[PDB]
């Protein structure tokens, strides 16, 4: 539906932004082709990175990421992150995490992971974050708070 599609598009926008910010291009990894929401998310993401990038500088080594272990590892991290609840900050961390994982993957010859991560992010957002989001003011409220 329009809802699921918009969340998938939001993920593409954020990751494309993040990937391009690092000298990469979305088209290099996927054939899948500014609203205030997208703008606010890109901005929150940058802010989170400017604050914690260094501590999250080597995700693939810390998690021992390989094409064969990425699937389960990603899911375990996101499940633990939201195991007891959700807030906008954790959602931003979720995005930054996914974005950082995408960049590192291509930098470390695992570009095949970009499309998968994008889908994993969008699927988790739609199935396990959307409910909290719509019950907490929706993305519009996120824009008002982090805009």
């Amino acid at each position: 539906g329009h809802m699921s599609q918009s969340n998938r598009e939001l993920v593409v926008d954020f990751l494309s932004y993040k990937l391009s910010q690092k000298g990469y291009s979305w088209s290099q990894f996927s054939d899948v082709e500014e609203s205030a929401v997208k703008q606010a998310l890109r901005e929150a993401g940058d802010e989170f990175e400017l604050r914690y990038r260094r501590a999250f500088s080597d995700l693939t080594s810390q998690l021992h990421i390989t094409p064969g272990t990425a699937y389960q590892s990603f899911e375990q991290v996101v499940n633990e992150l939201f195991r007891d609840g959700v807030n906008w900050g954790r959602i931003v961390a979720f995005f930054s995490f996914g974005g950082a994982l995408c960049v590192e993957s291509v930098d470390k010859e695992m570009q095949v992971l970009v499309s998968r991560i994008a889908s994993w992010m969008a699927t988790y957002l739609n199935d396990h974050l959307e409910p909290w989001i719509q019950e907490n003011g929706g993305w519009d409220t996120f824009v008002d708070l982090y805009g």
Partner: peptide, 19 residues
């Protein structure tokens, strides 16, 4: 991941409080 997820929780929570 557990360790990474918990770093994201504490930092996401710190980030949340700031805004």
């Amino acid at each position: 991941x557990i360790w990474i997820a918990q770093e994201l929780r504490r930092r996401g929570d710190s980030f949340n409080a700031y805004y």
